[PDB]
Design a protein around this nucleic acid. Structure first.
Lengths: 193, 172
DNA sequence: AGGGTGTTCCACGTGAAACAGGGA
DNA sequence: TCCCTGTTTCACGTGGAACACCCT
């Protein structure tokens, strides 16, 4: 139960090659263990609900002669983080981009998909999707949004276009007084066919 | 909360149903006892400290090694049962095992398929009248045909080439 | 686009059965 | 004649490559 959550964020291998990479210690692993990833325990890595790793025919019977049994926990920063981030995620007073940040933060730091994210914050999942594509825009565009010269609808049409295109269409959107509808049409003929 | 914590304190049971821990072979770690334990801080002294539901690893190591170490004297059925056990009493991918015992993954598979054969077939392989060359060809087959062909193997003493050919016709 | 698994079929070295001398 | 031993050849089950299906 510990590992399926350990592996959870961003490894290139489904098992994190961190318990088996002990390989042969070669008097070389107790030297650079040093500042390691902040939380681990010996053969099996009880997270917050401490537990035991399953078979370990090999991994627990090599052991080593000089051990660090040190009980150290890191988790609390991360879980206090999670409550802080979710508690943030639902806020009346949030500009589109900060929100999008917290969405992206949760989606990346932890694995639970944007669908559930959307269940928490009570919106559709294509919404969390679009609020988050808001982050990739030009800085003229983000400035415009924050400045409320344009609105998330407009900005959400602009994503995927080079900065030059973005800033032309943005220049049109403002001072042609465009509507999200007109904006989607105007943008439409600048995307591929 | 506090009330429930005084509750199991007075009551003999402590854990009316004991907690579950693991033994590191050096230390002890919990499984689903936060309630029991935190509550049992108000109670006194260590209050489990005797055989209660717990998982021990040293035992599991003995198991791990007795399994991994076999004098190659076993017939295909305890062999199969060991292979299965190695992925049944613990969860394993067949490939990994193939790597351990120095056989191909296929060999592991077929050896384990041996365990799903008719009682008659199984008992003719633990007895010495059938081989695995024979037995593995009768898998995924209905009982009646297992019986039929089996009689044909034992009766006419067919070579597995025969047996595979003969059983071929009783397969789609 | 991928690993895990079940299922088919035949390559392979082993071991011996057959054959061939050969010493009487 | 018979037994012993040197040689050639190929049947056998074993285990594996390969194929085929799920599960994703």
């Amino acid at each position: 139960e510990l590992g399926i959550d350990e592996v959870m964020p961003n490894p290139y291998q489904p098992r994190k090659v961190f318990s088996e990479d002990s390989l042969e210690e070669l008097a070389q692993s107790i030297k650079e263990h040093g500042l390691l990833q902040p939380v681990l325990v010996v053969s099996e890595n009880g997270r917050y609900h401490l537990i035991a790793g399953e078979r370990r025919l090999r991994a627990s019977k090599l052991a080593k002669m000089p051990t660090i049994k040190a009980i150290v926990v890191d988790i609390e920063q991360e879980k206090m983080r999670e409550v802080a981030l979710i508690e943030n995620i639902q806020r009346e007073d949030l500009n589109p981009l900060e929100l999008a940040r917290s969405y992206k933060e949760l989606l990346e730091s932890y694995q639970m998909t944007q669908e559930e994210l959307s269940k928490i914050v009570k919106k559709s999942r294509a919404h969390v999707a679009n609020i988050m594509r808001l982050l990739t825009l030009s800085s003229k565009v983000q400035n415009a949004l924050l400045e409320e010269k344009i609105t998330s609808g407009h900005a959400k049409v602009l994503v995927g276009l080079d900065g030059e295109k973005q800033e032309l269409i943005l220049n049109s959107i403002i001072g042609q007084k465009l509507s999200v509808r007109q904006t989607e049409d105007l943008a439409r003929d600048f995307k591929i066919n």
